Amino acid sequence: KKIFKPEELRQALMPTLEALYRQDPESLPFRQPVDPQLLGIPDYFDIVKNPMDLSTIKRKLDTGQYQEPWQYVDDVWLMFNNAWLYNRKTSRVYKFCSKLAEVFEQEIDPVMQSLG
Ligand SMILES: CCC(=O)N1CCOc2c(cc(-c3ccc(OC)c(OC)c3)cc2OC[C@@H]2CCCN(C)C2)C1
Numbered sequence: 298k299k300i301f302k303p304e305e306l307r308q309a310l311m312p313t314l315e316a317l318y319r320q321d322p323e324s325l326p327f328r329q330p331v332d333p334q335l336l337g338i339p340d341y342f343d344i345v346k347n348p349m350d351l352s353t354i355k356r357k358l359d360t361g362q363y364q365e366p367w368q369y370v371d372d373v374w375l376m377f378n379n380a381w382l383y384n385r386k387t388s389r390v391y392k393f394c395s396k397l398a399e400v401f402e403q404e405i406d407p408v409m410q411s412l413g
Pocket of ligand 1: 322325326327331332336379380383389
């Protein structure tokens with residue numbers, strides 16, 4: 298307690314996710330799960346033990362898998378930290394991740410205040 302209904306969390310938090318999706322080209326590496334099979338990077342899951350991406354976060358909101366808002370924030374940051382862990386600092390993915398984190402920080406704060 299506080300108790301959050303899945304519908305309130307979705308209503309309040311989805312705009313913050315949409316803000317990330319709206320970033321182009323910066324969201325593009327983040328819209329679906331990393332496929333180490335396709336990209337030929339079999340070490341990806343050795344390095345990244347808990348993968349996360351926007352599609353997965355959107356599904357969790359959509360299907361009521363978050364009980365409290367910090368679980369959502371933690372997944373967003375997991376996505377960021379996975380990308381900064383794995384990718385070189387000159388890479389598109391890395392630079393795009395840094396942009397997404399700037400955008401997210403701005404959106405998430407007033408939302409998290411309201412939700413309490
Ligand atoms: C969070 C994503 C991630 O950490 N990856 C794990 C790392 O692999 C990649 C990955 C994605 C991209 C990438 C880039 C640009 C895109 O649109 C503009 C895009 O759209 C789908 C994807 C690039 C990746 O790597 C591209 C090459 C792969 C071969 C080595 N080289 C250094 C980078 C996946």
